[PDB]
Amino acid sequence: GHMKDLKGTKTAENLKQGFIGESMANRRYLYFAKRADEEGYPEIAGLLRSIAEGETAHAFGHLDFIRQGGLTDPATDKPIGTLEQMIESAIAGETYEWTQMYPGFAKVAREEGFPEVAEWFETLARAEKSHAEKFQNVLKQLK
């Protein structure tokens, strides 16, 4: 039942879009909670944190259907069935970000006259290269 093949369906696309939205909702609500914290609204901060746990549960349930339905990781288009595949998906996305995505973002920010944003993107490119290397060391261990 939950093992039915979802490949080629609109439902497959909808699970991907739901995962994206849920992922953003958790991040948004935790960020909003920091503002409630500063301003002295602990009940609102607590509600934001509790609802954020709900959006974790939603995002993880979307990933369960993606994996059980034979779909790929929404971020990388790589299989994530096994732990080894999960680490290979982590490596693929980190490698895209440090080789291509953040360096390109930093070049654009400098060109448009945002050097402070460009320095941030350059920091992140170096950070994602470190992440890729740490994950590569783990994959070598598992294999």
Annotated binding site for Zn(2+): 55, 94, 128, 131
CA distances from 10 to 13, 15, 54, 60, 68 (A): 5, 9, 25, 19, 16
Which residues, 6 or more positions from 78, have their beta carbon under 8 angstroms from its beta carbon? 72, 85, 88, 89, 92
CB of 117 to a second copy, least distance (A): 6
Of residues 24 through 63, those in contact with Co ion by CB under 5 A are 55, 58
Report if residue 78 touches Co ion, rule: CB under 5 A.
Answer: no
CB of 142 to Co ion, least distance (A): 19
Residue among 38, 39, 43, 116 that touches Cl ion (CB under 5 A)? 43
Residue whose tokens read 């953003």: 24
Q: Minimum distance from CB of 99 to a second copy (Å)?
A: 14
